[PDB]
Amino acid sequence: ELAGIKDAAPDATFRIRGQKLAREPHRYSGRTAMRANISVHEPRQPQDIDTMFTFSMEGNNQPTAHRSQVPFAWAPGWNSPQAWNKFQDEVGGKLRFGDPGVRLFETSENGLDYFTSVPARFQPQDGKWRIAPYYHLFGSDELSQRAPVFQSRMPQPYIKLNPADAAKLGVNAGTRVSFSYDGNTVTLPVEIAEGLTAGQVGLPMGMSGIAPVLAGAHLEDLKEAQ
Amino acid sequence: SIWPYNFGLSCCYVEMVTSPRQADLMVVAGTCFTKMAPVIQRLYDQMLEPKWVISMGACANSGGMYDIYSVVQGVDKFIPVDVYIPGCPPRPEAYMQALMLLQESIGKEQGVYRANMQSERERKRGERIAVTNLRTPDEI
Amino acid sequence: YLPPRYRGRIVLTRDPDGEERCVACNLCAVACPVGCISLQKAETKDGRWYPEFFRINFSRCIFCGLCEEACPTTAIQLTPDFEMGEYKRQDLVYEKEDLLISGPGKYPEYNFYRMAGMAIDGKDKGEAENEAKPIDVKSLLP
Amino acid sequence: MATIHVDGKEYEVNGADNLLEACLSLGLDIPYFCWHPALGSVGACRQCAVKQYQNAEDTRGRLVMSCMTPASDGTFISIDDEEAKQFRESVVEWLMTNHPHDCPVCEEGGNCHLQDMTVMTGHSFRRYRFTKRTHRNQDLGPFISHEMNRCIACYRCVRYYKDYADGTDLGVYGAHDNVYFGRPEDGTLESEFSGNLVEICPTGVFTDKTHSERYNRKWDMQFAPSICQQCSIGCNISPGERYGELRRIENRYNGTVNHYFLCDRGRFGYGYVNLKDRPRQPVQRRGDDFITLNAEQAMQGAADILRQSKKVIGIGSPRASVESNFALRELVGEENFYTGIAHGEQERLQLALKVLREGGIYTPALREIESYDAVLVLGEDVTQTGARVALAVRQAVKGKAREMAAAQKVADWQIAAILNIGQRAKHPLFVTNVDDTRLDDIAAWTYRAPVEDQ
Amino acid sequence: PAWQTRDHLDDPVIGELRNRFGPDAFTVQATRTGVPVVWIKREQLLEVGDFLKKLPKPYVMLFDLHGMDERLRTHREGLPAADFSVFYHLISIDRNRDIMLKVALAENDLHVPTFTKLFPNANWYERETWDLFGITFDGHPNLRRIMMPQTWKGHPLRKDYPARATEFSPFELTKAKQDLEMEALTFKPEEWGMKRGDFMFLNLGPHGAFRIVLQLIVDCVPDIGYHHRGAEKMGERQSWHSYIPYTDRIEYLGGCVNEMPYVLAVEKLAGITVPDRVNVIRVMLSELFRINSHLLYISTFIQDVGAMTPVFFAFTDRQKIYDLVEAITGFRMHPAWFRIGGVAHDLPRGWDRLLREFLDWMPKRLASYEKAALQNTILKGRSQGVAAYGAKEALEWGTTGAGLRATGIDFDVRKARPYSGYENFDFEIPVGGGVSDCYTRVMLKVEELRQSLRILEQCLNNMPEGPFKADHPLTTPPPKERTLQHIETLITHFLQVSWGPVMPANESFQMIEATKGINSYYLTSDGSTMSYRTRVRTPSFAHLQQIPAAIRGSLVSDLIVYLGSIDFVMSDVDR
Ligand code: SF4
Ligand code: SF4
Ligand code: SF4
Ligand code: SF4
Ligand code: SF4
Ligand code: SF4
Ligand code: FES
16 A cells, blocks of 8 residues: 555666756855864765765756756756746646656545434533634644744633633633543633534643643533632 | 975975975975875885974865865875965965974974963964954055 | 065954954855855844854965955955964864954955944944935825 | 747747746746746736737837736747847846845845846946935744845735735735835734745845744755655655754745645744754663663664563554654564554544545645635634645635636736636635634635534 | 857858768857867768868867766757767967867767877877766777876766765775885886887886886886866866866966966856956966066076076066065965956056066066076087977977977967957067977077067056956956945845856857967856866877977986976876
């Protein structure tokens, strides 16, 4: 089932007329001064045995080179992102020799049967609160929430409630409320969500403390924090 | 009393002019090449026990501007060097200041002696940094 | 005796107001044929670009002066001084504290920030050469 | 399809295209600012001027704009005509009258489209001696810095942000030579696709703030073709490194998937690579003490204990590569290999795989999404997870205006005519979520309900 | 203009080639070389070549022979399909015209017939083409490596070969020990040349250091390549502007003479005509360096074959010339002062008084030199008939300069093909009486030194007014005072020193009269900001190739005198 990955990119013996594909622009600077504060003797250039690319500027990045993997776009007289026009067949089209990437599976000749597993209609329960998942572009992903520039772009941790359910609980916007998941206790400030239906509880998925496995789970206890 | 064997070759020995088994000093100048490097290694071997080597110029200190397939990147790769004199080409006064910087090593002895840790970068620092005004370059 | 245009030791100069003249634009590093300049841009809270570190490998340098003529601030200049010599090649690597001198060198009066549109302390918008005052879009005058 | 005559030579081009996108495909360099391949032609900057003749014998013609001129069969144009060249130089000269002296301290320097076109026209001598107009700046949030003095009024930013990306908080203000591009007041740009403005703006007005902390020029970068790791869409990227740290994230063109645009999580979420807390050497514990090992020591130390163990299991990850999971699977055996995701998340993923492989329904690429005529979104808050699909779905909803304009014989590149014909007519889009989504401004109906009700 | 692209179809050599081989047997390329360029097939190379050798005003000299890779050349409109190419530059003195023949090759079949039978100077050129590219010349007697050592795998001017030393593994001395052992066991396998042979094989190594294997003179074989710096390869990894320092180091005595053909060739690709003040300034610096080189040749010539006590005063005069050069340019040697479109700065305001002091100072010394060398008998007796050659030997081996002019062939480049405004000056071309030897060559140089001082007299009194840089968008860099104040000038300066100036796809070619012989630059642009191919023709390579033909029948002392008389430097030879 993973046989297509061989054709996704060429191997480390692929050459453009004997040249390896370059990683650095041809005007790359500081070769004899970058590492000169540790040792004045220039080290050897890193050697890549895994891929067709070289850890240097001594290689090829021609717009008309027969390849699909283009590390960066540059042309004579076009130093900006507008240099991608030289690498396409028609401007705004596909890359000249084809876009990189291959589809592992093609469309099957025959389809499936109809799924007859229709769920019953949702009903709220006293005590149990369904966890409605809320996702954020700048908080829900594991690696990128550890970026320091994302700390201010992500919102404050909250807990979203229907107005009728917050009226039954007795809270308003901003009140810190406590709940129990799996024997643990987390306290969060309440936010009010009119479009959220009653019996549900909005949590931000993938944050520091709220795992995405919690989607579709249940909160047994919910009360004002003291 | 220092006896100099000058192996200056091209475009770096023209300043030296303006400035076997008998020498104790080898003043390597010029570009050191991959093809001719055994010649300098045998001439270094021929000399007697108390050797001193002065590298002058960027082509002998490093490869200089010739970071190219046919040039070795410095004479210090294969022979020990004592003094380095930057420039392309250096000056006769620099050659004089090299012999003056080397007699201090000849009179200071493992010849570091914990006194050669002081460097001209730090020693002439308060001289060079206090400079404010320089002559305008539209005049002779 | 040396002429004024002599190509010896490379220094970094200062403004007549006393700040370092280098704005870490990296044009001197790229224009060098030997690749003997490394630097990184830093920025003050005032907003002034300046080099975090400036490193010249004088073992490699050929004193061609292409760095001086590349510089759009007159910060890097070549001085009449050939007196250099060291026991170690590692001591031919000069940092910014070995290169930054106390005055403006060959060009006593040029300040780049007075030309530049970018706003730093002492020069808000419209306080540069041949620059008018900013007009807001909400202004009553058509 | 069509044949045109350019500067005496003869070429074969597509008739539906305009003259700028025809001639740029043939390798004929015409300067331009306001045109974009994604955004279409509006005709504002007047930089793309060519001389057009009526036939082969007409010696004195007229200056037209090649972005606004169709490449019909029988077209006679001259890029290198002297009057066209002088006018194109004058357009650069008029833009240079109010431009600040900022290239050493501009982050667009060396990667600036205005710098390239100024050289390409061959305008190097200043005649203007009067004062320059200045603007104050806005705060646009933690990602994008603002410098309005560098603006050339090409209108690419507003055409991308409002028309293409359907953002609401960027507009043009003022009139005549005092036009101001920005927000009504300071604050964060609300769009999830705000960061494409750094590539879309041909000057240094909108620049990457995350890159200006550790800035380096483009020629000092080391680039590799890479894939975004922040979600499942697979946008092609070109990460750049200097001095051992990842510096910026650039869009890598792929005409099948992402083309010119990335999302903000992909563009700005790279900072975890540059953390000081990452392990750089193998580390072995000894009670409370920690021992640092090299690669050879770590392998010999680990396999001594692994030989003495009676059963070794392996836990993979969805954020690890295919070669990394397989190698883990090869080390413990396939009977001892676990995926690392929960059982309920595993059950939804293999059912999602089953309908793609065995459903018999084609699954479109990210750019093929923009050709569809109706979209039903069930449960997936797609702007927050898979954000480039939401950008692709907005373009699909605009297909209704393209169909009406085609019936009235308006060309595909004349975007302001197509938008005028449309007048809020949309292809139908029906989204279901537990709350409101960011696709609600263009959706025909929104259904807020629990997941069983969806 | 003198830079516009021409096919040279009105040259009379093409019409007689049409009437001899037909219209379908070649293909004409439109260049900016100034000469016709014709693509011929390799099966017709010898027929076309020997046809030009017996034209009624024949092409007598093979100027250059080298190769191009051409595999990564994207702009190839009009050319035949080539994977490699070999060019042949031929010169007719009687027509004052040149022709270039280009042979196209495929990557599997790098084979072309040798040109050595027609023109003897082609032997070293084909060995270099075999060394640096992988073209095999069929019929070559000793086709071995002339630049790199004999165990060097790889052809360094191929485009798949990495240029930089850092890209290879450093000097770990694994190969230094093996090369040392090989050099220690210096023995003759009878492969180092013809080597027919009782016979004592001796290696003698002496203004440059090189080895020669001599048979004791029955046979002598120069071994060169000890000073190879990869200058031609360096042109591919440097921009057009940042390559300029490397030009100054092809010849150490040349200085600004060496920069002149390169900047003139780049200005043809740029389409720049320079102002008159640029022409007079460039001619001034080139005649100053020419005087310095000629005084060095006359000085060193008098020291080896005579008493060196009076002529040591010439060091003070060379010190005055170096002080005047570093007053104008900045630095005594390797100025790197010529720019694309002009020079680096204007002349400083006190230049006239120093040049006037040098022009007043020089005639007394010059007339003492004429007395010291023209009237002497001992050096004249040791320099007359010492390895002499004539006009037939000069034109065979591509010998130019004082050598060629010492025979009856009056051929200067400054009069035949004027460059840099040399045609607006009043100077004479000295010439010998048909025999080129050691006395005649030195006497010619004394006459040339006086003519150079006449050119400097006209430069001081007719120095015109105006810019030191052309007004053109490819003038690199722009004037700095405009760069420091004006944004469009700053934008042009920003991209020119960083990415580089964009030269459009063409081929240019310039020849200048150098301090020693004729130096040329053949530059190819593929439309980028770096050169695709840079070819440097140095006359010393031909002059050093000519010595085994003339020294055969002489002593070792005659070899030392002949080597001291010829105008050769090993930096020129190996580049
Ligand atoms: S250091 Fe400079 S002057 Fe000396 S040999 Fe090398 S290039 Fe020539
Ligand atoms: S020295 Fe000049 S060119 Fe170099 S970084 Fe500083 S301002 Fe830029
Ligand atoms: S003088 Fe030349 S070699 Fe030295 S740092 Fe400046 S550009 Fe580099
Ligand atoms: S936007 Fe471009 S032209 Fe304007 S200052 Fe920045 S780099 Fe220079
Ligand atoms: S801000 Fe940038 S994209 Fe917008 S109009 Fe100005 S120059 Fe064009
Ligand atoms: S949609 Fe955004 S996060 Fe997902 S792959 Fe593309 S750029 Fe990365
Ligand atoms: S690009 Fe055509 S008018 Fe602006």
